[PDB]
Amino acid sequence: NWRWFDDRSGRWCSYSASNNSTIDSAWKSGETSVRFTAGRRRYTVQFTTMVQVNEETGNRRPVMLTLLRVPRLN
Amino acid sequence: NNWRWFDDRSGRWCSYSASNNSTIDSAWKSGETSVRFTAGRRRYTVQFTTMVQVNEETGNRRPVMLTLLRVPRLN
Amino acid sequence: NNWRWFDDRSGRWCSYSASNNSTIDSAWKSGETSVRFTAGRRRYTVQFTTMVQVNEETGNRRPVMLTLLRVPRLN
Amino acid sequence: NNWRWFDDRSGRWCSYSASNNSTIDSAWKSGETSVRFTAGRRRYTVQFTTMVQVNEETGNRRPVMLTLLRVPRLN
Ligand SMILES: O=C(O)CN1C(=O)c2ccccc2C1=O
Ligand SMILES: O=C(O)CN1C(=O)c2ccccc2C1=O
Ligand SMILES: [Cl-]
Ligand SMILES: [Cl-]
Ligand SMILES: [Cl-]
Numbered sequence: 438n439w440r441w442f443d444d445r446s447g448r449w450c451s452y453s454a455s456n457n458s459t460i461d462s463a464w465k466s467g468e469t470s471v472r473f474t475a476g477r478r479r480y481t482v483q484f485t486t487m488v489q490v491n492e493e494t495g496n497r498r499p500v501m502l503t504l505l506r507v508p509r510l511n
Numbered sequence: 512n513n514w515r516w517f518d519d520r521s522g523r524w525c526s527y528s529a530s531n532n533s534t535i536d537s538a539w540k541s542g543e544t545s546v547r548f549t550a551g552r553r554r555y556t557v558q559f560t561t562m563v564q565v566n567e568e569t570g571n572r573r574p575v576m577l578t579l580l581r582v583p584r585l586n
Numbered sequence: 587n588n589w590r591w592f593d594d595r596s597g598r599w600c601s602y603s604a605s606n607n608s609t610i611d612s613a614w615k616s617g618e619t620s621v622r623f624t625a626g627r628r629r630y631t632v633q634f635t636t637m638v639q640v641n642e643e644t645g646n647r648r649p650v651m652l653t654l655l656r657v658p659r660l661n
Numbered sequence: 662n663n664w665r666w667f668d669d670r671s672g673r674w675c676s677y678s679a680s681n682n683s684t685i686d687s688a689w690k691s692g693e694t695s696v697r698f699t700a701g702r703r704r705y706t707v708q709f710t711t712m713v714q715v716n717e718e719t720g721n722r723r724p725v726m727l728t729l730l731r732v733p734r735l736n
């Protein structure tokens with residue numbers, strides 16, 4: 438359900454199942470931010486700005502949370 | 512017509528008129544905690560902190576909901 | 587504790603038990619159109635296409651709601 | 662001011678003008694899959710199926726977001 442934007446290709450991208458679960462668990466727990474890793478890369482998702490920050494370079498990639506329709510369609 | 516109120520007599524969610532829906536939705540978007548509107552000789556207050564509509568003439572309380580559209584939109 | 591049902595006897599939204607809230611929310615996140623649960627030896631079905639809980643013994647329909655977290659989060 | 666686009670140069674989400682926000686939000690509420698708007702003569706298309714704004718003069722694609730207000734509202 439979480440996505441990050443890639444400015445090189447101009448497209449939204451999905452996280453791995455593990456990183457998506459780490460982000461979503463912190464989101465549901467009321468945390469304002471969450472740290473996660475992808476190989477040698479280290480990131481912080483800042484929920485107050487909806488931005489992923491690369492801890493090493495400071496590169497910012499916007500993030501989004503997909504929303505399910507309420508009510509659900511038949 | 513994104514706001515609805517539940518009718519326990521029929522067991523269904525009901526839409527508001529375009530005018531009353533707009534009054535409710537403008538107060539919602541403006542950050543107000545409640546909003547009043549009129550319909551059929553009755554004044555109602557929608558309490559956004561509880562998502563309940565109160566009939567100011569009778570005191571009767573009916574629940575309300577805000578419909579949400581999918582993000583992203585489907586093709 | 588994100589799902590609620592309206593109780594017209596008390597005039598208030600009511601929380602589900604942690605177990606029933608998890609059962610409902612798991613079906614909601616899986617894309618199901620409905621979910622079954624039990625409470626106090628009674629069987630209920632939540633219909634997500636209408637946002638209504640149906641008492642399987644009496645047929646009584648009560649509305650349900652899903653609480654929504656603000657996006658972005660406040661600091 | 663509920664819609665935002667991300668400015669990669671400053672690294673911040675940005676609000677639209679009241680007029681462009683209204684154009685975008687009206688198309689969103691009408692169920693349209695995309696909407697065109699202008700900032701002066703500069704042309705843009707917001708694609709709701711991808712949540713991307715396309716600058717129709719440079720071709721640059723910027724992501725967009727819809728802010729969501731908490732339900733129920735806090736007191
Ligand atoms: O007064 C009642 O008994 C039920 N009732 C209406 O007739 C009505 C009309 C427009 C908006 C809300 C309501 C509502 O709750
Ligand atoms: O059966 C009824 O009369 C009312 N009722 C309950 O006592 C109850 C308990 C837990 C979840 C839902 C319900 C519900 O609708
Ligand atoms: Cl970007
Ligand atoms: Cl990065
Ligand atoms: Cl009423």
Ligand SMILES: [Cl-]
Binds near residue numbers: 601603606625
């Ligand atoms: Cl329960």
Ligand SMILES: [Cl-]
Binds near residue numbers: 641644646647648
């Ligand atoms: Cl019941």
Ligand SMILES: [Cl-]
Binds near residue numbers: 719721
């Ligand atoms: Cl540009």
